Amino acid sequence: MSVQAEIGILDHVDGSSEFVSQDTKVICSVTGPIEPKARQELPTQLALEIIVRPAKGVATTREKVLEDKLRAVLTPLITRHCYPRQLCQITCQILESGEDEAEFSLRELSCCINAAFLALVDAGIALNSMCASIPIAIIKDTSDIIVDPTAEQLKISLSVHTLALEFVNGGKVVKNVLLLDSNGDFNEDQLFSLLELGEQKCQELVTNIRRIIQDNISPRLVV
């Protein structure tokens, strides 16, 4: 599990986190709740605006959808009624690819969720549950399934997959699925098998994470 993270590493920003998995370095930033614009408010719930900068090039359409699916996942994570007529701008930076951006977007989508989850903990906003995302691929030639592949394995991968889950009761109960990003060729039969490791693995991920949060923040906490 060659993952590792940092909390509270920016200065003027409410929530900040560096998430580092095996090859990709991504930092996310959270500022909120702050003053919303005119065209942006909601009378009841909390308004969210999300920016992802790539490592390379500028913000285009390829960025836009990875943003927007990430809009969908955070919306139930946030206790959105708690902050009416408000705004939390959240911003993600891709620093390292770790995957061919021309051909793939898979790991980053797993990465940025795992990034933005922790900067909210830095931010300390009313949230709902716990979460995790992993990238999963199925090899074209071997026809086997690897959790957390590499980009060369992505080249021989047949189908690329991202699973986002909602974890409660010690992060143990799968409360709901958040995202299942099925891409590539697949059938019925692989899919329930495709969950069935990530059923375990994301909890196994969070099992690491629960420790990490308290280790970083209980010395920031006072006794």
Partner 1 sequence: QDRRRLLGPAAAKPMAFSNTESEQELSLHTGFIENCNGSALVEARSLGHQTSLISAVYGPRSIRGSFTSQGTISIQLKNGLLEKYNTNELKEVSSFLMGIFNSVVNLSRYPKSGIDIFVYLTYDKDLTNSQISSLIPHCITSITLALADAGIELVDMAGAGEANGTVVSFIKNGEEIVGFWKDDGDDEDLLECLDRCKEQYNRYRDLMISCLMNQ
Partner 2 sequence: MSTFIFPGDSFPVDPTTPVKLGPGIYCDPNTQEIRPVNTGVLHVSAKGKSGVQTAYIDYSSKRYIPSVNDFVIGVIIGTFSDSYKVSLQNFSSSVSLSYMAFPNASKKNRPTLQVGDLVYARVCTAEKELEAEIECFDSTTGRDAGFGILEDGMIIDVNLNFARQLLFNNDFPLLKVLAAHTKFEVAIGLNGKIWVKCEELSNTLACYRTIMECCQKNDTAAFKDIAKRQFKEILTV
Partner 3 sequence: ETIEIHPITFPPEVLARISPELSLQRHLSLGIRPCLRKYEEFRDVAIENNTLSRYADAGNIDTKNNILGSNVLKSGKTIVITSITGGIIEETEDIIANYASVYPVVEVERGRVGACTDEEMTISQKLHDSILHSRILPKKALKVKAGVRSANEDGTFSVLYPDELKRKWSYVLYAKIVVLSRTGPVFDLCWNSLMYALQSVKLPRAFIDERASDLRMTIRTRGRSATIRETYEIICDQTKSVPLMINAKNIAFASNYGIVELDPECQLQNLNTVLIADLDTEAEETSIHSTISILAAPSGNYKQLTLMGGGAKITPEMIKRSLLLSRVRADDLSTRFNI
Do 160 and 137 touch, CB atoms closer than 8 A?
A: yes
Which residue in this structure is represented by tokens 């951006």? 101
58 binds partner 1 (CB under 8 A): yes
Q: By CB under 8 A, which span of 50-58, 85-93, 145-153, 178-186 interacts with partner 3?
A: 178-186
Shortest distance, position 180 Cβ to partner 3, whole Å = 4
- Residue 75 touches partner 2, criterion: CB under 8 A: no
Using CB under 8 A as the binding rule, whether residue 102 contacts partner 1 is answered as no
Among positions 14, 18, 99, 181, the unique one binding partner 3 when judged by CB under 8 A: 181
Q: Which is nearer to partner 1, 60 or 187 (CB)?
A: 60
CA–CA separation, 152 and 8 (whole Å): 33
Q: What is the DSSP string of 89-124?
A: EEEEEE---SS-TTT--HHHHHHHHHHHHHHHHHHT
- Closest separation between CB of residue 57 and partner 1, Å? 9
Cα angle, residue 181 at apex, residues 45 and 178 outer, rounded to 5°? 35
Phi, psi of 114 (to 5 degrees): -65, -20
Site string for partner 2, 11-50 (x = CB under 8 A): ---x----------------xxxxx---------------
CB-side neighbour CA atoms (13 Å) of 50 = 22
Minimum CB distance to partner 2, residue 174 (Å): 12
- Measure Cα distances from 39 to 44, 48, 179 in Å: 15, 12, 28
Question: How far is the CA of 134 from the CAs of 98, 108, 117, in angstroms?
Answer: 14, 10, 13
**Which of 171, 201, 202, 205 touches partner 2 by CB under 8 A?**
171
For residue 94, what are its two tokens? 């891709």
Stretch of 56-64, 79-87, 108-116, 206-214 lying at the interface with partner 1 (CB under 8 A) = 56-64
Binding site for partner 3 (CB under 8 A): 61-62, 64-65, 68-69, 72-73, 75-76, 103, 140, 155-156, 158-160, 166, 175-188, 191-192
Binding site for partner 2 (CB under 8 A): 14, 31-35, 79, 81-82, 84-86, 121-130, 167-171, 175, 210, 213-214, 217-222
